[PDB]
Amino acid sequence: ATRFASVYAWNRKRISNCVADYSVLYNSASFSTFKCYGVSPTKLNDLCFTNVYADSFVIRGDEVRQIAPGQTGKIADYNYKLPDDFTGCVIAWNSNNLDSKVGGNYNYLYRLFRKSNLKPFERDISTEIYQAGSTPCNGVEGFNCYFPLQSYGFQPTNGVGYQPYRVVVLSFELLHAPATVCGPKKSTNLVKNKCVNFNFNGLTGTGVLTESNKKFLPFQQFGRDIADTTDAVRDPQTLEILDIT
Amino acid sequence: SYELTQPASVSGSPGQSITISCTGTSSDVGSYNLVSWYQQHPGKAPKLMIYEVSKRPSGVSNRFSGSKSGNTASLTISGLQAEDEVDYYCCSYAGSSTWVFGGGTKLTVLSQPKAAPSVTLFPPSSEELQANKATLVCLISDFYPGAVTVAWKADSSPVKAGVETTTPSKQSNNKYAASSYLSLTPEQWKSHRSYSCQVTHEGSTVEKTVAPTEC
């Protein structure tokens, strides 16, 4: 995406019920900070979740350590918190090369001034002034107003921790629910006229795969005829009727 | 124009307590915790003593302490010394990111020993009488406190043509200095036989007899 938001200004979207290959980014390797939390990064294309919400924002290149489950900082206390046992993966890499220009990218900001801690997955957008004691301002920016949004500056000349990083937050949950987005599944081709194991969409067996003579009806997958002799299976790719012996 | 209301002069004893107030409005003191107190030597800048009203600074002498009660603030001063007699001011966050300072509080320190002034009246310069003007230079120093009255005596006659009475000026060693000036004409200078500056500081007067030059 050519346009992002600040870490306090992050957006929440949701992708459900399709195919998403996540490990295809491995050999793509536009990475700096490949990391998952609490789950193995391999089998995300194998098994999958519901409530597969997604986030995206910009982070200055030094506070990347603060994205850690429970570990506080500029981000987890004041900008965006991920809880103890953050179900998800967070992978970061540089965005100086497009989401930064000369003179400083003074468009993204960060919240610093807030009384208390944040929530899991919290969008802490507000228009509130700070107070360290008991006496607030009268509107004009002074000694304890503390407009919490100080402008991030991203020049093409800064250090190594002073660069904008593209980073996403994979907001995941586990509620017993209909099954949304998973990885695309390895549809290896068929074989005919040989005793062979197979595994179709869930159900499986082992025998030969040959043609038929009889037709199906437009919602059929597999046919059993006498006492679950599941023999007449239409193939899921070519949508043509086959037989199992 | 826009200052903070204080009593201009308080007084206390060494080793005791005193409270200097700072009364403002409903936009400077009654909604902000920033009644801060400074230490201005007359002729110098102020000096940071009290700020962040209930908090105390690092390593600074504990003889000053501020407190704020609504609109009327306070400077709870405990343990006066000889080094407390300068110009005192309170500063407040005057609302809408503006600032305001005090109306002055001249702490008059009691129980200090009065010093006798070393009086020496001067004749004017030899380069002044040729230019047809003259001056009586009366200089008063080592005196405490600042209470002076001017009474000139020029050969058993009071001089009231241009009496200038001064305001006190602090020295560097917690004493006070002064400078009195009586201009006359040289056509009247040689007429008067003797000159004496009789300054009455705290009652006493000491005069010195100078005369026009013989040559």
Add this chain to the structure above:
Amino acid sequence: EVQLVESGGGLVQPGGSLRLSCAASGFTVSSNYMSWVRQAPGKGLEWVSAIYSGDSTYYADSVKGRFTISRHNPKNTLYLQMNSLRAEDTAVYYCARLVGALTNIVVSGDGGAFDIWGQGTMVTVSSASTKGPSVFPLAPSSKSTSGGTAALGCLVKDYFPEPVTVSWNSGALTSGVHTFPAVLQSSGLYSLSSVVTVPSSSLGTQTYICNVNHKPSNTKVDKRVEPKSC
């Protein structure tokens, strides 16, 4: 090197301007809160302006629209351009660094102080033009010469405006330099005297020339004090 440098004050007509330059040292004004303080000498302190770190300019009541504050973030100098000058502007102008949380002495709370100080400048706003001093070297009294407390002086008389920072004998004399403040005469003419308590044994031998400079008049008077000789 914590230092504030207020200077540049002088003879300014009512209806003119003057640009000060608070050379801030010990820190930078690019990341610290700043303010100006005006004060007639000995009178009440009076606040002027508040530029903040990052150039947000805030003023007082009377100076709202009149004075013009400006800085330079690498040069570290707080400027005070002054338009619409009044007769009440006879005041010493102190720049003073405002304490916030970006000031290095406050972690939590409120801040609000001035810790680093300078010397102040003498911006004189009056209709009177320049006039040089009349330095009158006061002859010593022979009674104090016999007493040992040698009292010689030089009367820096009839000059305008402030100040004269009196030094003795190309600045080599430090002890006893006690320049008395002037009284406001009826003639409108400043007059100070300068009597140092040097020993009586240096009379005639040591060349007594008080170094008097009146900077708004460009008149530095080399003037010798001489004893009673015939």
